[PDB]
Amino acid sequence: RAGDRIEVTGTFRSIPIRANSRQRVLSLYKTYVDVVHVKKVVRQITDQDLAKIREVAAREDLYSLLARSIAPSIYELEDVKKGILLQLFGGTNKTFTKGGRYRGDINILLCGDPSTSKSQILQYVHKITPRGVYTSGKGSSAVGLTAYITRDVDTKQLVLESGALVLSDGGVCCIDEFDKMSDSTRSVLHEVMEQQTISIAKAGIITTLNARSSILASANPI
Amino acid sequence: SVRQIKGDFLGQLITVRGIITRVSDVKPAVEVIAYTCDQCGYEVFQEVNSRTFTPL
Amino acid sequence: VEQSFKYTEPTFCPNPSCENRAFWTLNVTRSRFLDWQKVRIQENANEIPTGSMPRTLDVILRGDSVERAKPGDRCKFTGVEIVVPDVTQLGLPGKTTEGLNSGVTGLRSLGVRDLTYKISFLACHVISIGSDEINELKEMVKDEHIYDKLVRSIAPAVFGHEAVKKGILLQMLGGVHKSTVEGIKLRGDINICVVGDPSTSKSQFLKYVVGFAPRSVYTSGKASSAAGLTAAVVRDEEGGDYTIEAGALMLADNGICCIDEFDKMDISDQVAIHEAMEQQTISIAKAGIHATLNARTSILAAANPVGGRYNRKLSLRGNLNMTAPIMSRFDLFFVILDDCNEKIDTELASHIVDLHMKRDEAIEPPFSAEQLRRYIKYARTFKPILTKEARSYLVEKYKELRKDDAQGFSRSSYRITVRQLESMIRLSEAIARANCVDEITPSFIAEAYDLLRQSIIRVDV
Amino acid sequence: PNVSRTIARELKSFLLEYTDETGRSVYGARIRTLGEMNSESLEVNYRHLAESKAILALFLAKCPEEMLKIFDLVAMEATELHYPDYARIHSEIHVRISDFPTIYSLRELRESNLSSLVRVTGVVTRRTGVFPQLKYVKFNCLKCGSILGPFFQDSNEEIRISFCTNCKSKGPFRVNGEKTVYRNYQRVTLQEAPGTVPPGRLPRHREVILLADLVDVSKPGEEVEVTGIYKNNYDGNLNAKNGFPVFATIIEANSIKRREGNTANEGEEGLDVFSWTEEEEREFRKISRDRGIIDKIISSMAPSIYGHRDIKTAVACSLFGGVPKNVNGKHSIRGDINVLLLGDPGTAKSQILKYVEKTAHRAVFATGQGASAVGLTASVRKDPITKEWTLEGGALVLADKGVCLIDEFDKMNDQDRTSIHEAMEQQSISISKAGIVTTLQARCSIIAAANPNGGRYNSTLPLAQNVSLTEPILSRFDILCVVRDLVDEEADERLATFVVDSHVRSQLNARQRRLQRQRKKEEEISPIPQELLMKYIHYARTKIYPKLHQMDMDKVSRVYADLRRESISTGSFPITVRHLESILRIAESFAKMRLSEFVSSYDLDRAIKVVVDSFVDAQKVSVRRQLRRSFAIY
Amino acid sequence: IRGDINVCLMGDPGVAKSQLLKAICKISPRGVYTTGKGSSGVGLTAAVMKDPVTDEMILEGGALVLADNGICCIDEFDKMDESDRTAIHEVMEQQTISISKAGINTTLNART
DNA sequence: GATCGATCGATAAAGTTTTTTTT
DNA sequence: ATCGATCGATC
Ligand SMILES: Nc1ncnc2c1ncn2[C@@H]1O[C@H](COP(=O)(O)OP(=O)(O)OP(=O)(O)O)[C@@H](O)[C@H]1O
């Protein structure tokens, strides 16, 4: 895929080019490489790990054992460590056939004293989940999240890329700056709080696509 | 300087100072040629003119 | 026969020894045609690794399969593959090193060129995932207490509140729309709201209806800046300004839209939807010509009180938190009350835990979802007309009613005028449209009179 | 072949020998009338079309265009005996076809529809002008016969050849300049109007090629619907998509009509007949020489609403209009009348404006929020990729009798209201924002739907305390209709027992028996039905001009002077030189409905006693003292 | 863990104090200078822009994608702040100098 | 009838500061 | 200005 650190084991070649598009005339060449091998730099579930965790599951202090494991450097603060692993242990989709469609996902938040590893804990949660998100300082916006029209440099046509809240289909939405966020946005997260979806009203097309999501909020004082 | 090099300075040898900008990359230019017929093996040679040319 | 990917010139085997390949004349008479279209596809959301420019390709629909492919949905296809070049013809003259394989493709028998080959795709068939039952209606129409059977079988996520359960069912069905000739088209529906304290049982109906109703959208109505609730055209893009836009009124054409949170909108849209309420069209002239669009709608609302707790001794004239004439333009409400008793919290606790069980399906709605859904589809195919002379009985009730809410010549302008008389009969036919009776009795309008009146004494102290 | 020669005999009989509905030679009468105006057009009645398709359904939907070419040459002989030597002027006629029982939108076209009759709606976008078309290609060789006769050129195909009947060489074909007449050509492209369409999606495009006597009937922006044929032009060249085995689309037209309204009819009000030839104009005089018509017309105008009388006096007077009386090299005179309603939230004020939109001839309905400060009047749309900054007007240049709803859009009230109160004052206003200094001419009319801040009696104090609209823009109107409803029984039932009966108003003979059912459903008390009453307003406005006298004047002199004097010491809102100008203007409005050109004595005091009472009845508690002055006028 | 602390100054002299700071920045190793105009906050990191007729959509940038482990001396802090004010936090916020455009979602380092 | 030579016709171009509503 | 295609003439 595009956008990774890479190493190639390539041979070398060179091709001619036609100057005029409709003649056989040709003279400053263009080179290109031909790769033979490239290198960057459901899990296969075994049974020794299930046997290993059942020793840990035999230990009654697994709550306390997971209390001490989440902090390699953080001060103790037992109360915040409760819900974080609990939100990471994010329930399941206890869905009925008719009626309901409730999901067991909940939403914790925190605010208070500035820079108490408010970000590094969120960075630490980004470590423990492989497929997740990461919010930015106006990297996404109201119209910059989803619902795109953008005139791309390859074909100058339409492309509908999903927002980060839909992109966490199998993760935890880590999001910040919830006192400096603009009030043009901070209006569609109520829908993903409630109908678990994003309604798109764009010139392209309509779509009630869902978003299997799970959120936490890291606010700031004023 | 380049402000006064307009005249009889074509086909001559002049040093000019300045500031280098817009550096391109290194590309292979052509100076000789060898077409193969895969029958006789006489690789034909020719000189290279300006930036566009034509095979035989 | 068999015109190929570029064969716009059938020039083979004439009958006599005439000038072959000299000309052609594409007859529009005998050469039969077929109809097609060319659309683009895109990859589904639950397969992308990251935002890594999700690539795509293009299809061709050939037979009757045109127009079955509604754009913007999950879809499947047939699966024949193809490759199509087009570079040399009679008319117009035919980055990186794309088409580098094309230099191999040169030297055909006609003129030497650089013919490419790009991958494409052809389809043949589309699909889009995402009796006694007709006699069952004839058995179920011959029941007796289905007006009371249906109201108990609306939503398992709610308990009690038997007043507001009656109203939403009438909103769930439709009324009448046929009206007088050469002029006014009258009302077509009812529009009911309920205000109450947030994080209570008000939010459960809103969850209930948007899956229960046909094509009914839900919108918070907080984005009062760009578009949506407010209708506003888009800027000049790719070949023109003044193009129409979406929003949760136009696609509620015979659809039941639901908007909440009336307090936080601006001071301009409160006449815009007020225009949308009185009759069934809206108008726009923003930097383009006038548009004649008719959003045939029926709204559903739930605003917030002025303090979160409803006072008791006063009226809601203070606690409506909006202006006056939209409330008179509206119907009546039956505001949900609140209390903290020792008994109701305990039974609601037992009411919620078996629901929040993974599987405790011991509660029995006496209907199912879909047999109720097809039942009202039988109910909409009548047109009951008042025929009896209870209109003389009708007129004295309102004439008594108007002398009550006007408590003086200088009393407030919530004077329930002749606007509400239309609702006073168009609900009155719809309740008889529930019990499948094709005419109006004076017995049926007994529940019609007090339904405003028990809720107007909620207004009038 | 040759049997089509007899076809012309087989229909000139079948058309001209008899016209339906008790004879009267209907189609035999409208031929000579459009011969008199010299305008090159005919019609076909649908019921005649229903009867002239029994042997012709397999000659309409099978072959639509070459049937018409042989249908064209019989209409010459259908009028050559009537008007001799009519072919010596303009030498040409071609027919047009009326309505059709299809409802096709733009989406629903397939292969089965082509080379046949079609009918579709839409809206007109960007359009070109008028060019001449060669239409008769006198071909030209160089050395052989250089006159191959005037040809019959087709649509966008460029029908020519290399060599035929002279040689077989590559000598090209040229032109010369003897006796090649020209028809014109105007390629409006069409966009689907966003009316009957499943919304939230895109518009779709077509192309329309007009023809000779059908040029510039449409205006850009206005809604139209077209009836014509379908055609194909496989040019074998397209450059948006790749070249492919495809073919374009060209819709040629035979007729065009204006926007229609209240699409619920079965046999009328979809075809713009508006052709008051014999059964109307011979009739319409005795309906004008009765004694209580102005007491009958305005009572029977808006039938659905019983209400107070004076609004229906005013709103009928508004669309009847006055006269744009020009003058010598000096200042022009406004020829418009601009009412303004004021109503309680719940009376019928939103319906009379809705109903009058249908009964007019042309209209617009820019209402409420979203009315741009410029989009009402003309605006400049920027150029496409190789064009110039052109002028594309919006609402007010299209509408000659337009209807707005300026109630209280207060956030935009300080935006647009500086652009509507000079449509009246400095009438025929146009603008030069970054473009050309021009002046379009729009003699528009304005009605309004004002709305106070709550109840109707929001104060005892004058109307500057009541409405948020200030003085000078408010003074650009003529009259202030105000409503009142406090407490009643017998007047309350007079609406209440009335409106309940309105809800009770919910195959050749049976088509007319339903039409006879259409008579009695509006003739309960029989208040002069609207089948024909709108049909004569269109020449109540474009055929008759009134004048005045001088002996019946100076009674009004003290009327303006004393009432202005009586309202400056008691200043609510003033009257100026323009109120008396409106006094004589609505006076001659009534006399135009007698179809009379004069002004009586009965119409002046009628027109006085509709303005003086409607001014004074909004003052104060002290309206009772002013009514003691009132009968001195009577 | 964080290193490379950042010291800020304030005050309004009439000396045009850029000579008091940036003269050091013009002799210090790997110390690049910027101003208000030109390289904004989106123009601080890298971006994809127009190029000549040769290979377009190259990853042109500002300072922080090329002044890694050096000195970023800035002036005019109230200039182009709609993009600047977020991105200057994103070097003090650890290791998120990235180009999160529609092109790619790759992230480079931050040590200045 | 086929091949070669001569003559005639067709084929190659490029963009990114003022001005509108709008948030 | 150059290249390709078509037509005419000669063998
Ligand atoms: N005098 C009347 N006669 C018959 N019908 C009436 C009368 N007054 C009101 N109605 C009915 O009441 C309905 C409500 O529309 P109404 O005319 O009251 O809107 P409105 O209050 O005029 O709106 P707005 O104040 O925005 O102009 C109408 O459909 C109309 O049929």
Q: Report the CATH number at residue D31.
A: 3.30.1640.10
DSSP D171: P
Is C210 contained in some domain? yes
Q: How far is the CA of E72 from the centre of ligand 1 (A)?
A: 70
Beta bridge partners of D119: D227
Residue C122, domain member (yes or no): no
Atom of ligand 1 nearest to the CA of C325: 25
Residue contact C96–E102, C-beta within 8 A = no
A21: the nucleotide nearest its CA (via C1') is F12
Residue D297: how many other CB atoms lie within 10 Å: 16
Distance in angstroms (rounded) separating the CA atoms of residues B25 and E55 = 11
Residue numbers preceding breaks in chain A (C to N > 2.5 A): 26, 41
Q: How far is the CA of D83 from the centre of ligand 1 (A)?
A: 55
Helix intervals (H) in C279-331: 316-319, 325-329
Are the beta carbons of A202 and A93 closer than 8 angstroms? no
Our measurement of the distance from residue C354's CA atom to the centroid of its chain's CA atoms, rounded to an integer in Å, reads 33
> What amino acid is encoded at D67 in this protein?
M
Query: Whole-angstrom Cα distance, residue D272 to residue D290?
Result: 29
Closest CA to A146 of A131, A132, A159: A159
Q: How many CB atoms sit inside 10 A of residue C23's CB?
A: 9
The verdict on the CB of residue C104 being under 6 Å from ligand 1 is no
User: CA of A205: which chain D residue's CA is closest?
Assistant: D201
Give the integer Cα–Cα distance in Å for D627 and D621. 12
Distance CA D624, CA C280 (A): 42
Give the helix ranges, DSSP H, for C295-343: 316-319, 325-329
- Cβ atoms of C391 and D500 closer than 8 Å: yes
Residues recorded for chain D: 634
- Nucleotide nearest residue A20, measured CA to C1': F12
Residue type, C430: A
Closest CA to the C1' of F10: that residue is: C93
Among all residues of chain E, which has the CA nearest to that of C51?
A: E105
Yes or no: say if A147 and A166 are a contact pair by the CB < 8 Å rule.
Answer: no
- How far is Cα C274 from Cα A68, in angstroms, rounded to an integer? 59
What's at D262, amino acid-wise?
N
Q: Give CA–CA dist D555/C39, Å, rounded.
A: 77
Task: Please tell me whether residue D524 adopts helix, strand or coil conformation.
Answer: coil
φ, ψ of residue C273 in degrees (nearest 5): -75, -25
C interface test, pick of A25, A155, A206, A210 with most C CB neighbours within 10 Å: A206
| β-pair type (D390-392, D379-381) | antiparallel
Contacts of D63 by beta carbon, 8 Å cutoff, 6+ apart:
none
Nearest to D541 by CA among D322, D353, D352: D322
Is D382 known as a binding-site position? no
Per DSSP (E only), the strands in C164-316 are 192-193, 258-260, 282-284, 291-293, 300-302
How close, in Å, is residue C248 to chain D by CA atoms? 10
Q: Is the dihedral of CA C382, D500, D505, C281 positive or negative?
A: negative
Mutation target for B interface from A13, A21, A26, A32: give the one with most B CBs within 10 A: A26
List CB contacts (< 8 A) between C40 and chain A. 157-158
3-state SS, residue C26: coil
Q: Measured between alpha carbons, how far apart are the two ends of chain D, in Å?
A: 81
Closest Cα in chain E, distance from residue C237 (Å): 20
- In degrees and rounded to multiples of 5, residue E8 shows phi and psi of -120, 155
Of the candidates D43, D595, D200, D562, the one whose C-alpha atom is nearest the C-alpha of residue A201 is: D200
The residue range of the domain holding D30 is 2-88
Q: How far apart are CA D467 and CA D458, in angstroms?
A: 9
Residue C86 forms part of a structural domain:
no
Q: Quickly give A166 CA vs F8 C1' distance in Å.
A: 65
Name the amino acid, one letter, at C223: A
Q: How many helices (H) and strands (E) does chain A have?
A: 6, 7
Point out residues after which chain C has a gap (C–N over 2.5 Å): 94, 130
How many alpha carbons lie under 13 Å from residue A144 in its C-beta half-sphere? 12
CA C248 to chain A, closest CA, distance in angstroms equals 9
Burial B45-54 (b: 16+ CB within 10 A, else e): eeeeeeeebe
Q: Which residue has the tokens 């709103």?
A: D315
D8-31 burial, b at 16+ Cβ within 10 Å, e below that, comes to beebeeebbeebeeeeeebbbebb
A130 interface with C at CB cutoff 8 Å = no
Residue with tokens 């602390």: E5
Contact list in C for residue E103 (CB cut-off 8 A) is 53
The pair of structure tokens assigned to D127 is 């359009």
Instruction: Please count the residue pairs, one from chain C and one from chain E, whose beta carbons lie less than 8 angstroms apart.
Output: 8
Q: Are D448 and D408 in contact (CB under 8 A)?
A: no
Nearest CA to C34 among D247, D266, D537? D247
C-alpha–C-alpha distance, residues D170 and D141, integer Å: 11
- The reply to whether the CB atom of residue A24 sits less than 7 A from any atom in nucleic acid chain G is yes
- Measured between alpha carbons, how far is D526 from D509 in angstroms, rounded to an integer? 23
D150 backbone dihedrals φ, ψ, rounded to 5°: -70, 120
Q: Is residue A116 part of an annotated ligand binding site? A: yes
Give the C-alpha separation, A103 to A94, whole Å: 6
Determine the distance between C113 (CA) and G3 (C1') in angstroms.
Answer: 13
- Taking CB atoms and an 8 Å limit, are A187 and C45 in contact across chains? no
CA distances from C450 to C300, C401, C424 (A): 22, 11, 10
Per CB-CB distance under 8 Å, the chain A contacts of C42 are: 159-160
Work out the angle between the directed axes of helices D577-591 and D557-566 (0-180°, nearest 10): 130
Atom of ligand 1 nearest to the CA of D349: 22
Strands C291-293 and C282-284: antiparallel
Residue type at position C199: S
3 state DSSP class of E84: helix
Which residue, C62, C12, C14, is CA-closest to C38?
C62
Residue C358 within any structural domain of the chain: yes
Q: Residue written as tokens 């038997």?
A: C162
Closest CA to D349 of D222, D485, D254, D518: D485
Tell me the structure's resolution in angstroms, rounded to a single decimal. 3.9
Plot region of C295 (φ>0 → left; ψ -120 to 50 → alpha; else → beta): beta
Could you count the other beta carbons within 10 Å of the beta carbon of residue C418? 18
Q: Could you give the number of structural domains in chain C?
A: 1
Q: How far is the CA of C426 from the C1' of F18 (A)?
A: 58
* CA–CA gap between residue E50 and residue E87 (Å, rounded): 23
Asked whether D502 lines ligand 1 (CB < 6 A), one says: no
**Euclidean distance between CA atoms C220 and A200, whole angstroms:** 13
d(C-alpha A114, C-alpha D106), whole Å: 61
Query: D56 in helix, strand or coil?
Result: coil
CA nearest to C303, candidates C262, C273, C331:
C262
D523 — phi, psi (to 5°)?
Answer: -120, 50
Main-chain phi, psi angles of D288, to 5 degrees? -100, -15
User: Please, which residues have CB within 8 angstroms of residue C190's CB and are 6 or more apart in sequence?
Assistant: C170, C171, C175, C298, C331, C423, C426, C427, C430
- D284 touches D380 (CB < 8 A): no
Domain-embedded: residue C285: yes
3-state SS assignment for residue C2: coil
Please tell me whether residue C96 adopts helix, strand or coil conformation.
coil
Separation CA D556–CA D580 (nearest Å): 9
Which run of H or of E encompasses D500? helix D490-502
Any C CB within 8 A of A182 CB: no
CB contact under 8 Å between B30 and A30, yes or no, is no
| Contact by Cβ (8 Å): E14, E57 | no
Q: Residue C425: give its domain's CATH number.
A: 3.40.50.300
**How many angstroms does the Cα of residue D363 sit away from the middle of ligand 1?**
21
**Domain coverage including residue C331:** 133-459
Is the minimum CB–CB distance between C52 and chain E shorter than 8 Å? yes
**A108-110 vs A215-218, strand pairing mode:** parallel
> Which residues of E are less than 8 Å from A2 in CB distance?
104
Distance CA E63, CA D496 (A): 79
Cβ neighbours of A140 in C, within 8 Å:
none
Interchain CB distance below 8 Å, C52 and A30? no
- Show Cβ contacts of residue A110 under 8 Å, excluding neighbours closer than 6 positions: A80, A118, A216, A217, A218, A219
Which residues lie closer than 8 Å to A59 by C-beta, 6 or more apart?
Answer: A65
Q: Is D375 known to sit in a ligand binding site?
A: no
Flag whether E36 is marked binding: no
Task: Please report whether residue C114 resides in a domain.
Answer: no
3-state helix, strand, coil in chain B (%, to 5): 5, 5, 90
The helix/strand/coil state of C289 is: coil
Q: What are phi and psi of A200, to 5 degrees?
A: -105, 120
Sorted by sequence, the CB contacts under 8 Å of residue C102 that are 6+ apart come out as: C114, C115, C116, C117
DSSP SS3 for D127: coil
Distances from the Cα of C237 to the Cα of C233, C242, D138, D335, angstroms: 11, 10, 46, 42
E104 vs A4, A148, E107, CA distance in Å? 10, 16, 9
| Cβ C164 vs Cβ C209: under 8 Å | no
Distance CA D200, CA C253 (A): 11
Residue A161: CB partners within 8 Å, gap ≥ 6? Answer: A146, A148, C51, C54, E102
Structural contact between residues D356 and D403, judged by C-beta atoms closer than 8 angstroms: yes
Strand G, nucleotides < 7 Å from a protein CB: these are 2-5, 7
CB count, 10 Å around CB of C368? 10
Alpha-carbon distance A193 to nearest alpha carbon in chain D (angstroms) = 25
Can you tell me the distance from the alpha carbon of D540 to that of D545, in angstroms, rounded to the nearest whole number?
Answer: 9
User: What values do phi and psi take at C122, rounded to 5?
Assistant: -120, 145
Provide Rg for chain E, Cα atoms: 15
A21-43 core/surface letters (b: 16 or more CB in 10 A; e: else)? eeeeebeeeeeeeeeeeeeeeee
C52 within domain boundaries: no
Which helix (H) or strand (E) element contains residue A14?
A: strand A7-15
Chain position carrying tokens 């091998």: A37
What dihedral do alpha carbons E39, E45, E46, E50 form, nearest 10°?
-30
